[PDB]
Amino acid sequence: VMYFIGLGLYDERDITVKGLEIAKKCDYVFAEFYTSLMAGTTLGRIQKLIGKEIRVLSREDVELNFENIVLPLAKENDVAFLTPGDPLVATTHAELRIRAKRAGVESYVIHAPSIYSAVGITGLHIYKFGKSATVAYPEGNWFPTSYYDVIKENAERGLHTLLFLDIKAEKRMYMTANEAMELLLKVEDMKKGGVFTDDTLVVVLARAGSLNPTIRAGYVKDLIREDFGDPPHILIVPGKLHIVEAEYLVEIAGAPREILRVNV
Amino acid sequence: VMYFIGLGLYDERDITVKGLEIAKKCDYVFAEFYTSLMAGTTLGRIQKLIGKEIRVLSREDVELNFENIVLPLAKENDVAFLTPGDPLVATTHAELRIRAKRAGVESYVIHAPSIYSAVGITGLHIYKFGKSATVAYPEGNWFPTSYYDVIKENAERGLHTLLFLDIKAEKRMYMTANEAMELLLKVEDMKKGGVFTDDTLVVVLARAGSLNPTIRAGYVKDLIREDFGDPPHILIVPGKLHIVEAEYLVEIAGAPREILRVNV
Numbered sequence: 073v074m075y076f077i078g079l080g081l082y083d084e085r086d087i088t089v090k091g092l093e094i095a096k097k098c099d100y101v102f103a104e105f106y107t108s109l110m111a112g113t114t115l116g117r118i119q120k121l122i123g124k125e126i127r128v129l130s131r132e133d134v135e136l137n138f139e140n141i142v143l144p145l146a147k148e149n150d151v152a153f154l155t156p157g158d159p160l161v162a163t164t165h166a167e168l169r170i171r172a173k174r175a176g177v178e179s180y181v182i183h184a185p186s187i188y189s190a191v192g193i194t195g196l197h198i199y200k201f202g203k204s205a206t207v208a209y210p211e212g213n214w215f216p217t218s219y220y221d222v223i224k225e226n227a228e229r230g231l232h233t234l235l236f237l238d239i240k241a242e243k244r245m246y247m248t249a250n251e252a253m254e255l256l257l258k259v260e261d262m263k264k265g266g267v268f269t270d271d272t273l274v275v276v277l278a279r280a281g282s283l284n285p286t287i288r289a290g291y292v293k294d295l296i297r298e299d300f301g302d303p304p305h306i307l308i309v310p311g312k313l314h315i316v317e318a319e320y321l322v323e324i325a326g327a328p329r330e331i332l333r334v335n336v
Numbered sequence: 337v338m339y340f341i342g343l344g345l346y347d348e349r350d351i352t353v354k355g356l357e358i359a360k361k362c363d364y365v366f367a368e369f370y371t372s373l374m375a376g377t378t379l380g381r382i383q384k385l386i387g388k389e390i391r392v393l394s395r396e397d398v399e400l401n402f403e404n405i406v407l408p409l410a411k412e413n414d415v416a417f418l419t420p421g422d423p424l425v426a427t428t429h430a431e432l433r434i435r436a437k438r439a440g441v442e443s444y445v446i447h448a449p450s451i452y453s454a455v456g457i458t459g460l461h462i463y464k465f466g467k468s469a470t471v472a473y474p475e476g477n478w479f480p481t482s483y484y485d486v487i488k489e490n491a492e493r494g495l496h497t498l499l500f501l502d503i504k505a506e507k508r509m510y511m512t513a514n515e516a517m518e519l520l521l522k523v524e525d526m527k528k529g530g531v532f533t534d535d536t537l538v539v540v541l542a543r544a545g546s547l548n549p550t551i552r553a554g555y556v557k558d559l560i561r562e563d564f565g566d567p568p569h570i571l572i573v574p575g576k577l578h579i580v581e582a583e584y585l586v587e588i589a590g591a592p593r594e595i596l597r598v599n600v
């Protein structure tokens with residue numbers, strides 16, 4: 073059998089009891105730390121907590137040799153594949169389950185807290201979020217913009233936008249909410265849809281999962297230069313607020329009391 | 337100090353290690369099972385795993401008296417507030433942190449798996465979900481249908497719509513995917529907007545969190561009367577599929593081959 077087990081958001085403890093119970097009694101343990109950053113732990117602590125040796129795999133080992141490195145062992149033993157947060161959220165690991173099927177391997181998913189639901193601690197109603205997007209680093213003469221249209225589309229409907237920030241694990245590069253805002257501003261001049269400016273209200277959630285995450289709401293002009301701590305970060309562009317969402321942003325995220333005055 | 341700790345998705349093992357340890361160091365432990373129930377376990381088993389007695393709070397005990405029942409103790413003690421899923425996902429829970437602030441009480445959030453990220457196991461891409469909704473039971477002269485317009489607006493833009501099904505927590509009466517489909521067909525007959533029909537494709541997820549969840553995909557006309565096992569049930573109406581999504585539904589969720597040409 074094959075086990076996809078999420079490790080959670082911040083540290084090793086963010087794993088579900090079920091996850092740890094099963095990880096402990098597995099023959100082989102593999103993992104990847106390229107889809108996200110667990111800024112609160114080390115491979116050692118995970119290994120010490122699990123009680124097994126962990127073979128960390130690269131994006132390539134996975135995307136090209138999952139069935140060559142992991143699956144073979146899964147037909148004779150109980151093998152676990154570990155990932156940050158929930159293993160099937162904002163990743164392409166879901167497809168790996170098909171590889172397992174075609175390989176004669178039974179696979180199970182043990183969920184864990186994901187950043188996709190952790191946004192609830194921002195005060196924004198989770199059901200009000202619309203389509204999601206990723207702000208990707210520009211590479212060479214290629215400048216990604218799609219995520220800008222996502223914000224626009226949701227904005228018209230009154231919905232919130234969750235922006236997954238880019239990550240270059242191998243270069244130990246983790247995009248900050250600031251870089252994301254600087255990129256959006258640049259796309260705003262390029263497109264001029266009045267979708268993202270200095271006056272746009274944004275929400276920053278940094279290091280969710282830690283007992284002391286950074287939750288900040290405010291205008292780009294004021295937050296674009298603010299220090300939100302070490303990564304990972306996520307950026308949120310709220311749609312039409314609800315009075316209680318606004319009260320939470322002000323009371324808990326330190327937003328300008330003037331946002332309380334919702335323009336229904 | 338008080339802790340909002342998520343209980344997870346299905347059973348008492350879905351709580352995170354961090355959540356279980358903290359709940360054990362708490363002087364008092366409250367829990368609510370009105371926003372949702374844990375069908376994979378019991379209050380007795382959760383009480384035993386933590387090794388603390390747990391006082392259950394009704395919907396009114398919380399929404400009306402949270403500050404007179406839970407917060408008082410949090411002054412000279414460490415209190416735990418357990419909820420199914422991930423904390424603050426339930427819409428009225430985030431405002432409780434404002435109550436905690438108002439009362440001079442520090443609050444921390446201990447995340448856990450939520451259905452919002454767990455639906456990833458359907459093989460649908462998270463970022464493609466739009467606004468979410470709850471299918472409510474008609475009753476008396478009230479026949480709510482806004483959840484239909486959500487499916488309409490989401491699908492229109494190629495987005496998946498996550499549908500929470502009704503629940504009468506106290507009476508422990510869940511709405512089945514079947515009843516939800518019957519209801520939608522009935523609503524389509526009302527508004528006739530070509531949103532939900534016998535030919536519409538849907539995905540039914542039952543018992544997320546369990547090692548053996550029920551994942552089924554197919555046309556309403558073939559699922560409207562299928563048995564998906566015991567509750568809870570989540571209904572999902574996908575927009576235009578990504579080929580990789582369709583193959584997953586065909587391979588893992590038992591969807592018909594027809595979707596590889598019809599819904600891609």
Ligand SMILES: Nc1ncnc2c1ncn2[C@@H]1O[C@H](CSCC[C@H](N)C(=O)O)[C@@H](O)[C@H]1O
Binds near residue numbers: 157185237239277304
């Ligand atoms: N604890 C955390 N705090 C803030 N952002 C986080 C985060 N975990 C993930 N992210 C965000 O999501 C990106 C990884 S996307 C993969 C998400 C992961 N499977 C999950 O379930 O969370 C990061 O670059 C960051 O922008």
Ligand code: NA
Binds near residue numbers: 452465466468
């Ligand atoms: Na969503």
